[PDB]
Design a protein around this ligand. Structure first.
Ligand SMILES: Cc1cc(C)cc(-c2onc3ccc([C@H]4C[C@@H]4C(=O)O)cc23)c1
Length: 238
């Protein structure tokens, strides 16, 4: 991700077939002539999409131009959470399924994985960050405390941001309960709250390298959303 001061991010297309698949997804969703009620509703939960971009002197170098969801925040606290029971797609080989399950073999039980967080601490005027190893180290026993950390500013638990997150996830969950034309593997929710405030939160869907047409509910995604909501709910009892 490259932040731009014009309030957008440029995401470089990943290698084939992932990058091309993601470009195609955004193009389908944000088709100018799209009248599909499901896809029109979905746009509410994605970053705004400004089309494909490439440097003036480099047509080969493909990016997606996306809304920077963190632009309107003073001290944005950011967490990326992968959603679902399977991070591998319907066209994965045995080798690839094994790779994907191994990266975080706990995916099926929990239904989500924290990919990283960046949390502003008020009393130090500074950021702590966690990388992919943090979330991959979380278990059933420690997932609640693991997620809680995102909402801890170093004096209070931000239950306002927790409750707001639940309410925004609930809307995404309602979208998933009302569609059976897309299944999402290895896709994420991006959480952003204001670290500096009260209950002002972004929750957006990102990372669409493994979205496929379907004829079923995305039961894996739903399981993950619900577990994540359940965890956030229990954090409110702290
Ligand atoms: C972690 C982080 C840090 C910072 C600083 C910004 C963002 C960020 O803010 N708005 C965003 C909109 C879309 C995306 C998605 C392209 C990314 C993907 O698909 O992996 C990332 C975005 C994220």
């Amino acid at each position: 991700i490259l932040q731009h001061p014009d309030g957008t991010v440029l995401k470089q297309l990943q290698p084939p077939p992932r990058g091309p698949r993601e470009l195609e997804f955004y193009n389908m969703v944000y088709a100018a002539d799209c009248f599909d009620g499901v896809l029109l509703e979905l746009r509410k939960y994605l970053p705004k999409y400004y089309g494909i971009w490439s440097p003036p002197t480099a047509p080969n170098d493909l990016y997606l131009k996306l809304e920077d969801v963190t632009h309107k925040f003073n001290k944005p606290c950011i967490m990326d959470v992968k959603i679902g029971q399977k991070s591998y797609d319907p066209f994965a080989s045995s080798e690839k399924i094994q790779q994907q399950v191994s990266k975080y073999p706990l995916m099926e039980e929990i239904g989500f994985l924290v990919l990283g967080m960046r949390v502003y601490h008020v009393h130090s005027d500074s950021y702590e960050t966690e990388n992919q190893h943090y979330g991959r180290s979380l278990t059933k026993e420690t997932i609640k405390d693991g997620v809680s950390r995102f909402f801890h500013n170093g004096y209070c638990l931000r239950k306002d941001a927790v409750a707001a997150s639940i309410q925004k996830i609930e809307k995404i969950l309602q979208w998933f309960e009302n569609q059976k034309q897309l299944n999402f593997y290895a896709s994420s929710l991006l959480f952003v709250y204001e670290g500096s405030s009260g209950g002002e939160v972004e929750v957006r869907m990102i990372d669409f390298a493994h979205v496929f047409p379907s004829n079923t509910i995305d039961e894996g995604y739903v399981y993950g959303l619900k577990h994540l909501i359940s965890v956030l709910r229990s954090i409110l009892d702290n």
